[PDB]
Design an enzyme around this catalytic site. Structure first.
Site, mmCIF file in Angstrom:
data_model
loop_
_atom_site.group_PDB
_atom_site.id
_atom_site.type_symbol
_atom_site.label_atom_id
_atom_site.label_comp_id
_atom_site.label_asym_id
_atom_site.label_seq_id
_atom_site.Cartn_x
_atom_site.Cartn_y
_atom_site.Cartn_z
ATOM 1 N N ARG A 83 -3.166 4.629 -2.302
ATOM 2 C CA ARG A 83 -2.781 3.322 -1.778
ATOM 3 C C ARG A 83 -2.835 2.161 -2.782
ATOM 4 O O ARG A 83 -2.101 1.175 -2.638
ATOM 5 C CB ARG A 83 -3.665 2.972 -0.576
ATOM 6 C CG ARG A 83 -5.095 2.613 -0.966
ATOM 7 C CD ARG A 83 -6.025 2.656 0.230
ATOM 8 N NE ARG A 83 -5.656 1.707 1.283
ATOM 9 C CZ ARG A 83 -6.037 0.435 1.324
ATOM 10 N NH1 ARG A 83 -6.809 -0.067 0.365
ATOM 11 N NH2 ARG A 83 -5.658 -0.334 2.335
ATOM 12 N N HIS B 34 2.925 -3.343 6.838
ATOM 13 C CA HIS B 34 1.987 -2.245 6.579
ATOM 14 C C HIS B 34 2.043 -1.222 7.716
ATOM 15 O O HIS B 34 2.812 -1.364 8.656
ATOM 16 C CB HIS B 34 0.543 -2.767 6.537
ATOM 17 C CG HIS B 34 0.261 -3.730 5.433
ATOM 18 N ND1 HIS B 34 -0.643 -3.435 4.446
ATOM 19 C CD2 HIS B 34 0.766 -4.971 5.224
ATOM 20 C CE1 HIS B 34 -0.676 -4.496 3.665
ATOM 21 N NE2 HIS B 34 0.159 -5.453 4.092
ATOM 22 N N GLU C 158 1.869 4.127 2.697
ATOM 23 C CA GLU C 158 2.445 3.694 3.965
ATOM 24 C C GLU C 158 3.975 3.792 3.946
ATOM 25 O O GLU C 158 4.680 2.810 4.153
ATOM 26 C CB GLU C 158 1.950 2.274 4.261
ATOM 27 C CG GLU C 158 0.459 2.281 4.614
ATOM 28 C CD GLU C 158 -0.252 0.963 4.399
ATOM 29 O OE1 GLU C 158 0.377 -0.105 4.568
ATOM 30 O OE2 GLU C 158 -1.459 1.002 4.073
ATOM 31 N N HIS D 110 0.898 -1.153 0.000
ATOM 32 C CA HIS D 110 0.000 0.000 0.000
ATOM 33 C C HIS D 110 0.936 1.202 0.000
ATOM 34 O O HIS D 110 1.533 1.538 1.022
ATOM 35 C CB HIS D 110 -0.898 -0.014 1.234
ATOM 36 C CG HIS D 110 -2.039 -0.971 1.116
ATOM 37 N ND1 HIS D 110 -2.562 -1.602 2.207
ATOM 38 C CD2 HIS D 110 -2.700 -1.375 0.004
ATOM 39 C CE1 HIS D 110 -3.521 -2.378 1.746
ATOM 40 N NE2 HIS D 110 -3.644 -2.276 0.418
ATOM 41 N N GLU E 278 1.567 -4.124 11.289
ATOM 42 C CA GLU E 278 0.982 -2.804 11.074
ATOM 43 C C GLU E 278 1.846 -1.942 12.004
ATOM 44 O O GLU E 278 1.720 -2.024 13.224
ATOM 45 C CB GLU E 278 -0.485 -2.772 11.514
ATOM 46 C CG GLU E 278 -1.456 -3.354 10.501
ATOM 47 C CD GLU E 278 -1.634 -2.463 9.279
ATOM 48 O OE1 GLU E 278 -1.121 -1.322 9.284
ATOM 49 O OE2 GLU E 278 -2.300 -2.901 8.320
#
Length: 305
Positions: free
Chosen positions: A127, A196, A72, A69, A270
């Protein structure tokens, strides 16, 4: 710039600088790092993977992809730091040295080149990929909803204009298919990690189904250990659990696919933060984020070896 030792790791870089960085690193450590091209993006940009190996033939491998993405940014920046880190720690850190002496590590710093270039060029928060469909005026697919794992089920949008559009069919995006073919051809991957941001979470399968994986106890304990290790540097708190019970249902995810391929150690990270800055994490937080994340990743690697 002229050497990976003069490269500024504490700031965000463009696609060209990251690609130049790869060639410098390979030139400085030819016996350890090699650059492979596994395909080309929709807009023709080369898709590169760095292979860290001390030898052997088709040794058990660890897959790590970042930036699927594009917005990020903390992920691609962490990937660059990771690449340098492997070359500095081999032969210095007993644990990492043992890992590299028996396993290969494949690192994909910019999984979505087209989106990345776009975030620098036109929209910092883009993204998706940049594939176009005559069916719509809208562009792109959410690459992490395009995999063949509960593809098209709840947790993804069938609307091309959606930020979570899954695509016309599983693996329709060349950026995804390039990874699928490479991993299936290799056939000896033991771990698959996808990075991510943001939220500070460590997740394992599944996202598309409520069904529990048969390795839940083990992955849950590994996750707990990784989180503990990561927190030891700056006190950063992470939460862990399956994708669906921790966040929400999400279909066509990469680790759900890898786990179904038999890659037991499939986890998604994440990174920072929890919302203060979100996707626009300050450059001053790059190194500390990379340093703590390394501790978590290595923990998972130690369990795979």
């Amino acid at each position: 710039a002229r050497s990976t030792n003069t490269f500024n790791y504490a700031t965000y870089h463009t696609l060209d600088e990251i690609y130049d960085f790869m060639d410098l690193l390979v030139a400085e450590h030819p016996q350890l790092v090699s650059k492979l091209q596994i395909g080309r993006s929709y807009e023709g940009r080369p898709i590169y993977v760095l292979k860290f190996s001390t030898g052997g033939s088709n040794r058990p491998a660890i897959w790590i992809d970042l930036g699927i993405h594009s917005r990020e940014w903390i992920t691609q920046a962490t990937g660059v730091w990771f690449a340098k880190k492997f070359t500095e720690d081999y032969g210095q850190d007993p644990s990492f040295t043992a890992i590299l002496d028996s396993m290969d590590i494949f690192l994909e710093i910019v999984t979505n080149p087209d989106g990345f270039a776009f975030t620098h060029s036109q929209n910092r928060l883009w993204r998706k990929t940049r594939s176009v469909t005559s069916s719509s005026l809208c562009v792109g697919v959410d690459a992490n909803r395009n995999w063949d794992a509960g593809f098209g089920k709840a947790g993804a949008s069938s609307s091309p204009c959606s930020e979570t559009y899954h695509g016309k069919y599983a693996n329709s995006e060349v950026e995804v298919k390039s990874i699928v073919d490479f991993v299936k051809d290799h056939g000896n991957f033991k771990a698959f990690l996808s990075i991510h941001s943001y939220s500070q979470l460590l997740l394992y399968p599944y996202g598309y189904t409520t069904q529990s994986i048969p390795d839940k106890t083990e992955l849950n304990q590994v996750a707990k250990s990784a989180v503990a290790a990561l927190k030891s540097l700056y006190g950063t708190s992470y939460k862990y659990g399956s994708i669906i019970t921790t966040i929400y249902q999400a279909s066509g995810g990469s680790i759900d696919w890898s786990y179904n391929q038999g890659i037991k150690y499939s986890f998604t990270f994440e990174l920072r933060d929890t919302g203060r800055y979100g996707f626009l994490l300050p450059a001053s937080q790059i190194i500390p984020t990379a340093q703590e994340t390394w501790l978590g990743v290595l923990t998972i690697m130690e369990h795979t070896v």
